[PDB]
Design an enzyme around this catalytic site. Structure first.
Site, mmCIF file in Angstrom:
data_model
loop_
_atom_site.group_PDB
_atom_site.id
_atom_site.type_symbol
_atom_site.label_atom_id
_atom_site.label_comp_id
_atom_site.label_asym_id
_atom_site.label_seq_id
_atom_site.Cartn_x
_atom_site.Cartn_y
_atom_site.Cartn_z
ATOM 1 N N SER C 374 4.107 -48.091 63.413
ATOM 2 C CA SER C 374 5.367 -48.526 62.830
ATOM 3 C C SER C 374 6.254 -49.006 63.961
ATOM 4 O O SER C 374 6.599 -48.225 64.849
ATOM 5 C CB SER C 374 6.041 -47.401 62.059
ATOM 6 N N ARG C 375 6.619 -50.282 63.937
ATOM 7 C CA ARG C 375 7.409 -50.821 65.030
ATOM 8 C C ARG C 375 8.871 -50.441 64.939
ATOM 9 O O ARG C 375 9.541 -50.377 65.970
ATOM 10 C CB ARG C 375 7.289 -52.336 65.078
ATOM 11 N N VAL C 376 9.388 -50.181 63.744
ATOM 12 C CA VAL C 376 10.761 -49.709 63.656
ATOM 13 C C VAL C 376 10.865 -48.303 64.225
ATOM 14 O O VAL C 376 11.881 -47.931 64.816
ATOM 15 C CB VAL C 376 11.264 -49.782 62.208
#
Ligand SMILES: Nc1ncnc2c1ncn2[C@@H]1O[C@H](COP(=O)(O)OP(=O)(O)OP(=O)(O)O)[C@@H](O)[C@H]1O
Ligand SMILES: Nc1ncnc2c1ncn2[C@@H]1O[C@H](COP(=O)(O)OP(=O)(O)O)[C@@H](O)[C@H]1O
Ligand SMILES: Nc1ncnc2c1ncn2[C@@H]1O[C@H](COP(=O)(O)OP(=O)(O)O)[C@@H](O)[C@H]1O
Ligand SMILES: [Mg+2]
Ligand SMILES: [Mg+2]
Ligand SMILES: [Mg+2]
Lengths: 173, 460, 512, 458
Positions: C374-376
């Site tokens: 998950s990049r967030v």
């Protein structure tokens, strides 16, 4: 070979000519248009990547023998699709459709030696019963057959040559 | 006047036919009124008589056949110069940030020939980035190219943000960011981070977003290149950041498939290695100025061998490989010290001091890799007195490579640190010599410079 | 050499008049019919993407504008059409009912009610194809959307405005995870949308019956494009769902949209492309299948309050709007290097990998944390979960690094044996039963129990009963703390004290 | 009125007057010598040309033959009179008896029932087969599919399901043989007739001898008969003998219809051809169709497009495998790949569900050990992994069962095992209370008592 793409144009031109009674003028118009396609300097142009309307207008100029509206319109339609080389075949299929509509046939008679002009009458009379059409003979002389006669009518042949008999016997054995 | 007319529309590919006197050249730009809007097309092929096949630089919907098309008798050309600093622009050089007209004096065509081999100059001035592991293990010179390889989520984009922030703040150098196939979420985060860190006035941005047709995503790299070239002619040293080469190659593959070219090795276009060279060959240091480049390159499915990363390797001067394992243990920047490499890492260029420090660090970490699997089985007390020393020093060295970035403060609240190269070499060379054998390991974690490890050890 | 729809009587017309007498450019005639594609002759003024109106009440989308032909796809049953039927080009593009009154309805791709509960009460119509919000109109995603799964909320946060791919092999819980993400919003303030592409109708019926058992159907729209519907509808189905979700985003509310098997939208589009004779790329997919999904998923956004005020003309002030996407993909034999998976993994902001080797071994949901991303990241978590989940990544990372020794585990040293037997317990902890979602207080409590070492005595066979008992204990005794965490997500030295006390009293004075 | 103009393999082109052109899916008729041939039109090309598929042998067709336009689709007899009789794809009777005295005829091309009409039914359906109703139980009105390569037992399994359901069931039943052996259709027809259940079964056969048109359309005929029985308010059994031949017959025809190839040479419309069939075979509020479908897997490749696009259309999927049949373990069902929608605690109860999950867990843990067992041998295993391996092999044996229809192959008599009697046995094997028996004590027995007995006799 343009046998398959010529069919639509041949049928359309023949229908149009039939409605307006000018079949005999349309055949001459197509003959001339096909003749201009065989020219050395034009067959070069037709191969170039000219735009269709420019190729048509430079082709139309070379023919004043075309009834100005419809005979030229055929050229324009063909030029749009890039099919002007198909004319020498539109012509032949036009002739065929005509021969069908006028119930006429043209049968070749191949013989070892010319016939008596009384034989030919009988052959033609018999074929006109083999076919619904009025026949036109074009007899020929061939030395490979050596007796009898070959009658070729379209793609149906009636073979009575002695040559055929010999080479059909040889296979029985 | 408008001499052309549309004759086909098939998706993003539009055919236009002109009178044969005035066919556009290749790569010329056309223009058409797509309803209450303007659309530019780029000529790709002159095919047949007067007809030309093009790619739409916008949504193709609403195009009729027969619309009037007008040919701008020049390639796509974009604004350049100081006017573009702090702005965001699309592939056509139009502002997408709502701050109004650009104000540019001069416009340059985005298609131009690369420097000849005699106009170049080779100068070995190392860049100083302020990141310990990069400066130490993967030095790169002005005019050279660096590739941040890795999977997804490892840190390519925040590492590039950090490099931009350092270059802009600590060295006052201009920069250009070409977002080839950019996710708008990350583009907006990047804009707000650059303007919050107060560096925006020294960056010029170009965004070809993912929701745009293939032609937009393809040509953006050349717009960023053209801006960076304008800054080079002024005699500056600029730095060009390409946000993903992988998406440059994908946009090329799509554009190729639309034009119907017969595909190649794994569905890639045939011209792949030529597009990559058309791009990468304009990035060089000439005798008048210099363009340095750092380039993120996604490796799909960890294989380093399919054509997209395989072809780019031929052009890079250094490669920094980022690993998700390292990142998951929490030591960002997540650079692997053993697999990252550089062509400049040899004594004749970096001096024997830097070279010996780098090779010593790699050797200590390589030995700790060996000892891990004995520690696992035999337990640690079966190690020699010297080997327990290699273990403790390798663990300290491995902590010390991590660093707190200024742009990462939003993720962890920790303030950033900039570390000069002298401090990096001095710190690592001290650790490897037993100077700091008395500090605890965690004294070195996310600590920036070495002098801040001794400060942190007092508090632990 | 082959003809291009030059045929006897059209040619004859042109023989008699080459410059077609000016004729309506607003109509044409069908000349061909096959497999759902019709070729129309005429329609000089047809525009790409335009809607063409056929006899009956049916429409086609004009997709190929060629030299004297329009290739269009029929949106519905085509077998009735016939060469020669006249057809008119409407000026319009496709639009779909949009409103708040769609919640709780089942509608087909054109917004026609399919559940039989009578007509809709929509709020006007919205164009199915729209451009996403620009770069300057976004806002950074910093709000959590809770799925109720320990494994997802701890280690792969999803934030309002994110696009998280769910990808895995057949029958691994891809639909289950998304429908639990929907059910969990029943009382969250997020409207949900579930759009089903190419599924058999009796599966949709069953998921709707499960959404209605739990109280979730009153708060979700269902868009159905069953496996029998023509490719045009299966391919346009996701865009109708996006156009219905963007109604809430553009008004300062939150929505969540789940595209079920985009890998079937890609196949319907491949069929349409190959029938229109477009050049095939890899695996026969058309060239522009990236631009298909890309411009779909880039509509999921979080838009700042100024964009909302502009859009609603000042009627709504001070509120950001959001739309979250959870597209689902199916990979054959775990190949993530196929054309369709290779694009959508590149578009989205995250990935949840569901694996069948885990699903069989009993680890359900089968989320694989070593390869999920998950990049967030933590920006989309409540700070209690952000604080506590940070130890789980490290526990499982050290476990993945030591897992190779599990088969020789007897010879290992007790130093690493403890890590190897801790990773197994925190893995057994992330297992969870379907339709049983957890509030953030329960997840935080359990992850705290695991991180701080409490589970070290509990045998691996009892972690499930330990958790099940702990939740009931806390529910009967400490409701006022759960009610606080669930409402603030905050974390403190005081909160840590209270939690440590709860765990001490439970592990001393209870049994499981 | 029409003329033939081309003949390529199974597809024929016909030219009609401009205003007389047939509609899609209409049926045309030709006189192929001393025969009558039926053509079903697929596409309308430009200019009055229409492209068709021949429902018969294409040989002997000249160009220029006159074809007659019948103005309706293919229609088949339907209803009670079609019962206990064998029929062609064209609805013609193919046994030597007289004509079918049907009152009504239906078109084989229909739309699937509306979403509003569907119905959902958790009513579990017992089959006396251990593996199928432990691992992948199915319900009245649901769909079952048997996936397998060539020669692994997906027809024997279907005949045993016929035995266990379709003799103990009151309503009518339908059997469609799509592209399979005629020997087996004859054997089935006589097995029915020699036990008087024939007069409640309706048969349709499009076996593998026949040209592509027959194998292509013969599935829709069986579906039409089943749908007639469904609409009367009954509940029906529909068995399809190989549904893979319905799409292969489409791949054969596709390229001649002028459609560009797709992924592995498949027609571009594969998923739509398959969906528009699989969607009309469903139960509804007025009546229910319960079905079993054999689904061939080419080259044993479960990721091939044709099997891959089918898994989504079934509720219970039973995946047979060669690497198990070649151990002599029949039915060769793979329990790590079979699955059912019905396997929920809320549907089968906590104990059935929990037993099934424990069995999958053991067999999976056993798969994970096979590589280390293969390299280092079995003695490097932990002292409890040897126990996992022993119980896994015992479970693999106990999943085997003797069928009543497989007596001809093995002599041993068939067995019927009830569900109550199999979850008990597997719970026993898992809990360790049979660790003293040898593996072979479990191979090819009925309930667990017969294993406890066979151990006495070795
Ligand atoms: N957390 C869970 N615990 C136990 N069983 C589960 C869980 N999640 C899913 N399952 C079961 O796994 C099976 C498959 O789930 P699901 O249908 O969601 O996967 P899928 O990928 O949607 O399958 P398909 O390929 O049909 O889409 C279902 O029977 C479901 O009951
Ligand atoms: N130095 C760092 N400090 C804190 N978080 C980081 C750092 N690097 C990466 N991350 C985490 O990784 C996420 C994505 O990183 P990014 O560089 O965008 O990955 P990619 O290289 O795939 O673009 C960020 O949201 C952040 O949470
Ligand atoms: N229960 C069983 N006992 C013994 N042999 C069996 C059993 N089930 C299947 N077989 C074997 O499976 C072989 C494959 O036959 P069949 O089921 O017709 O394959 P296919 O499914 O391809 O038609 C048979 O010849 C038979 O010997
Ligand atoms: Mg990035
Ligand atoms: Mg699913
Ligand atoms: Mg069989």
């Amino acid at each position: 070979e343009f046998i398959t793409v010529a069919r639509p144009y041949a049928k359309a031109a023949f229908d149009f000519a039939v409605e307006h009674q000018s079949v005999e003028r349309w055949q001459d118009m197509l003959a001339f248009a096909a003749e201009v396609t065989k020219n050395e300097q034009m067959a070069e142009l037709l191969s170039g990547a000219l735009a269709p309307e420019t190729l048509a207008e430079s082709f139309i100029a070379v023919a004043g023998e075309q009834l100005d509206e419809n005979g030229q319109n055929l050229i324009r339609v063909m030029a749009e699709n890039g099919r002007l080389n198909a004319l020498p075949d539109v012509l032949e299929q036009f002739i065929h459709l005509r021969a069908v509509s006028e119930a006429t046939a043209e049968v070749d008679v191949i013989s070892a030696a010319a016939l008596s002009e009384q034989q030919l009458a009988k052959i033609s009379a018999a074929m006109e019963k083999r076919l619904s059409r009025k026949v036109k003979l074009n007899a020929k002389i061939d030395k490979s057959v050596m007796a009898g006669v070959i009658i070729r009518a379209g793609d149906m042949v009636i073979d009575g040559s002695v040559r055929g008999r010999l080479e059909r016997l040889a296979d029985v054995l | 006047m408008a001499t052309g007319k549309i004759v086909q529309v098939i998706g993003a590919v539009v055919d236009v036919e002109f009178p044969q006197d005035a066919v556009p050249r290749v790569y010329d730009a056309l223009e058409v009124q797509n309803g209450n809007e303007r659309l530019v097309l780029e000529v790709q092929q002159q095919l047949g008589g007067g007809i030309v096949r093009t790619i739409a630089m916008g949504s193709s919907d609403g195009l009729r056949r027969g619309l009037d098309v007008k040919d701008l008798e020049h390639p796509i050309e974009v604004p350049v110069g100081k006017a573009t600093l702090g702005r965001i622009m699309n592939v056509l050089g139009e502002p997408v940030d709502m701050k109004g007209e650009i104000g540019e004096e001069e416009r340059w065509a985005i298609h131009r020939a690369a420097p000849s081999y005699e106009e170049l100059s080779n100068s070995q001035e190392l860049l100083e980035t302020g990141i310990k592991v990069i400066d130490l293990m993967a030095p790169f010179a002005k005019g050279g190219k660096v590739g941040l390889f890795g999977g997804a989520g490892v840190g390519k984009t925040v590492n590039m943000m950090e490099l931009i922030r350092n270059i802009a703040i600590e060295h006052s150098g201009y920069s250009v960011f070409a977002g080839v196939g950019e996710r708008t979420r990350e583009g907006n985060d990047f804009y707000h981070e650059m303007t919050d860190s107060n560096v925006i006035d020294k960056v010029s941005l170009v965004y070809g977003q993912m929701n745009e047709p293939p032609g937009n995503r393809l040509r953006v790299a050349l717009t960023g290149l053209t801006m960076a070239e304008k800054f080079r002619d002024e005699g500056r040293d600029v730095l060009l950041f390409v946000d993903n080469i992988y998406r440059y190659t994908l946009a090329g593959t799509e554009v190729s498939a639309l034009l119907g070219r017969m595909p190649s090795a794994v569905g890639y276009q045939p011209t792949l290695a030529e597009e990559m060279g058309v791009l990468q060959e304009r990035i060089t240091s000439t005798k008048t100025g210099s363009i340095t480049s750092v380039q993120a390159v996604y490796v799909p499915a960890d294989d380093l061998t399919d054509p997209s990363p395989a072809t780019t390797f031929a052009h890079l001067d250094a490669t920094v490989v980022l690993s998700r394992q390292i990142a998951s243990l929490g030591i960002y920047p997540a650079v692997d010290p053993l697999d990252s490499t550089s062509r400049q890492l040899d004594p004749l260029v970096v001096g024997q001091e830097h070279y010996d420090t780098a090779r010593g660090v790699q050797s200590i970490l390589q030995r700790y890799q060996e000892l891990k699997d004995i520690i696992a089985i035999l337990g640690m007390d079966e190690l020699s007195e010297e080997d327990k020393l290699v273990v403790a020093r390798a663990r300290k060295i491995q902590r010390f490579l991590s660093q707190p970035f200024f742009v990462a403060e939003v993720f962890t609240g920790s303030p950033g640190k900039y570390v000069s190269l002298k401090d990096t070499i001095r710190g690592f060379k001290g650790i490897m010599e037993g100077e700091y054998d008395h500090l605890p390991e965690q004294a070195f974690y996310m600590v920036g410079s070495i002098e801040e490890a001794v400060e942190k050890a007092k508090k632990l | 050499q082959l003809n291009s729809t030059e045929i006897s009587e059209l040619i004859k017309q042109r023989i008699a008049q080459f410059n077609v007498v000016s004729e309506a450019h607003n109509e044409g005639t069908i000349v061909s019919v096959s497999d759902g594609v019709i070729r129309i002759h005429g329609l000089a003024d047809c525009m790409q993407g335009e809607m063409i109106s056929l006899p009956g009440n049916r429409y086609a989308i004009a997709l190929n504008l060629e030299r004297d032909s329009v290739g269009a796809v029929v949106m519905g049953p085509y077998a009735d059409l016939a060469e020669g039927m006249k057809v008119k080009c409407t000026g319009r593009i496709l639009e779909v009912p949009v409103g708040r009154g769609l919640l709780g309805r089942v509608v087909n791709t054109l917004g026609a009610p399919i559940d039989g509960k009578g007509p809709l009460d929509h709020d006007g119509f919205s164009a199915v194809e729209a451009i996403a919000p620009g770069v300057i109109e976004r806002q950074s995603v910093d709000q959590p959307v809770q799925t109720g799964y320990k494994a997802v909320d701890s280690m792969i946060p999803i934030g309002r405005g994110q696009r998280e791919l769910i990808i895995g092999d057949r029958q691994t819980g891809k639909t289950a995870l998304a429908i639990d993400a929907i059910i969990n919003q029943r009382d969250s303030g997020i409207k949900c949308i579930y759009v089903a592409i190419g599924q058999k109708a009796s599966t949709i019926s069953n998921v709707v019956r499960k959404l209605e058992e739990h109280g979730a159907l009153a708060n979700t729209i269902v868009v159905v494009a069953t496996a029998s519907e023509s490719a045009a509808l299966q391919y346009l189905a996701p865009y109708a769902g996006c156009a219905m979700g963007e109604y809430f985003r553009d008004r300062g509310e939150d929505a969540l949209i789940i595209y079920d098997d985009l890998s079937k939208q890609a196949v319907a589009y491949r069929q349409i492309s190959l029938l229109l004779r477009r050049p095939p790329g890899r695996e026969a997919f058309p060239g522009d299948v990236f631009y298909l999904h890309s411009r779909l998923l880039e509509r999921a956004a979080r838009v700042n309050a100024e964009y909302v005020e502009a859009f609603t003309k000042g009627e709504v002030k001070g509120k950001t709007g959001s739309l979250t996407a959870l597209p689902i993909i199916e990979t054959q034999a775990g190949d993530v290097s196929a054309f369709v998976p290779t694009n959508v993994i590149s578009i989205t902001d995250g990935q949840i990998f569901l694996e069948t080797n885990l699903f069989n071994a009993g680890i359900r949901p089968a989320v694989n944390p070593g390869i999920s991303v998950s990049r967030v990241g933590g920006a989309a978590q409540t700070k209690i979960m952000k604080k506590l989940s940070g130890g789980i990544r490290t526990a499982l990372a050290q476990y993945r690094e030591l897992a190779a020794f599990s088969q020789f585990a007897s010879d290992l040293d007790d130093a690493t044996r403890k890590q190897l037997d801790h990773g197994q317990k925190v893995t057994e902890l992330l297992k969870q039963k379907q339709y049983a979602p957890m509030s953030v207080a329960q997840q935080s409590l359990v992850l705290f129990a695991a991180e701080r070492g409490y589970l070290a005595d509990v045998e691996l066979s009892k972690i499930g009963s330990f958790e099940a008992a702990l939740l009931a204990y806390v529910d009967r005794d400490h409701a006022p703390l759960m009610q606080e965490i669930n409402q603030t997500g905050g974390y403190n030295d005081e909160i840590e004290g209270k939690l440590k006390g709860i765990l001490d009293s439970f592990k001393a004075t209870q049994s499981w």
